[PDB]
Amino acid sequence: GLGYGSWEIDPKDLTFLKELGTGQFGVVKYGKWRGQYDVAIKMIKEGSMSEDEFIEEAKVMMNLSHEKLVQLYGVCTKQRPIFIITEYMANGCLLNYLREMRHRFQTQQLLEMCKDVCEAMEYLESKQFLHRDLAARNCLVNDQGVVKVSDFGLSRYVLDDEYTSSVGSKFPVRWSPPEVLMYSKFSSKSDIWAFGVLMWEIYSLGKMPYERFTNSETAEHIAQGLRLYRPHLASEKVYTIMYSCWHEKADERPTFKILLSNILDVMDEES
Numbered sequence: 412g413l414g415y416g417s418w419e420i421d422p423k424d425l426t427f428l429k430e431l432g433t434g435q436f437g438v439v440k441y442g443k444w445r446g447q448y449d450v451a452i453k454m455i456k457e458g459s460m461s462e463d464e465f466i467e468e469a470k471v472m473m474n475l476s477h478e479k480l481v482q483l484y485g486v487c488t489k490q491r492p493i494f495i496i497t498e499y500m501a502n503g504c505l506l507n508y509l510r511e512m513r514h515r516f517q518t519q520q521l522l523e524m525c526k527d528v529c530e531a532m533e534y535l536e537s538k539q540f541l542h543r544d545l546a547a548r549n550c551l552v553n554d555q556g557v558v559k560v561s562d563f564g565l566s567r568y569v570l571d572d573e574y575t576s577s578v579g580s581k582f583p584v585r586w587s588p589p590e591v592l593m594y595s596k597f598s599s600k601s602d603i604w605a606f607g608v609l610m611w612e613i614y615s616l617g618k619m620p621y622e623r624f625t626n627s628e629t630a631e632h633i634a635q636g637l638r639l640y641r642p643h644l645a646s647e648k649v650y651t652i653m654y655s656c657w658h659e660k661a662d663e664r665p666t667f668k669i670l671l672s673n674i675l676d677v678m679d680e681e682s
């Protein structure tokens with residue numbers, strides 16, 4: 412109605428029901444939109460976000476829609492804190508989900524998780540849109556066990572120098588290729604590198620990559636050519652796929668379309 416653009420949600424349409432934790436921009440809640448529709452609501456802590464830039468980008472991100480991508484519904488920007496309204500993912504972050512050993516996932520289910528992400532990433536790749544912080548912590552799981560990509564592109568609007576700096580405490584060092592760590596060379600191929608690390612997280616049930624190294628040691632390791640090695644639950648074929656993401660030469664890494672076709676092939680061979 413009057414006052415709200417297509418990207419704007421009226422916050423009075425929201426019912427807040429449960430706390431979902433805190434992320435880089437503060438508290439996230441579960442609620443209803445117009446008494447009926449499940450939504451998640453980010454409440455953007457003041458000082459944490461480049462808000463005007465985000466809001467202009469939210470207009471573009473409104474047009475991104477894929478079954479494996481957490482849907483943006485709108486923003487509430489007429490007062491602070493601003494809100495980001497999205498699809499709700501009842502089983503929460505993928506990292507915590509993997510770490511709950513009770514699930515006792517079969518390897519076919521782990522491969523489906525990788526496929527879910529790869530499909531989202533191929534979509535984003537098709538739209539020339541970088542994630543920049545692909546990792547299990549930043550994927551979400553719905554009530555049907557479907558994994559979706561979330562918080563894509565939002566790294567650009569983070570104001571926290573500990574996150575943004577390549578030597579900061581919060582920078583995703585362990586998900587970064589050598590050219591990111593050396594030169595800030597971000598590209599589709601740095602998302603590819605990160606996706607390989609994410610496959611490793613999935614097959615490792617959420618172990619920390621390079622768990623016995625610091626970030627500093629990890630940067631040196633990967634710059635010398637050393638890599639993660641095969642998780643116990645990963646077949647040789649699966650390990651070949653994740654490893655292919657880690658070629659020193661970015662231009663020798665696959666695309667998400669090639670990864671997707673490789674994952675489907677392995678599904679046909681191994682299930």
Ligand SMILES: C[C@H]1CN(C2COC2)CCN1c1ccc(Nc2cc(-c3ccnc(N4CCn5c(cc6c5CC(C)(C)C6)C4=O)c3CO)cn(C)c2=O)nc1
Nearest residue numbers: 431432433434435439451499500501502503544562565566
């Ligand atoms: C599983 C149950 C269990 N329950 C126990 C049992 O009773 C108590 C606890 C709650 N829990 C639960 C259920 C569902 C959800 N769902 C959702 C969580 C989130 C969520 C929450 C907190 N932080 C974040 N992050 C984390 C990532 N990130 C954020 C902002 C940014 C990032 C990355 C960045 C740095 C680029 C920018 C950011 O906001 C997110 C993901 O966007 C988002 N969405 C859309 C959800 O649907 N979460 C938790």
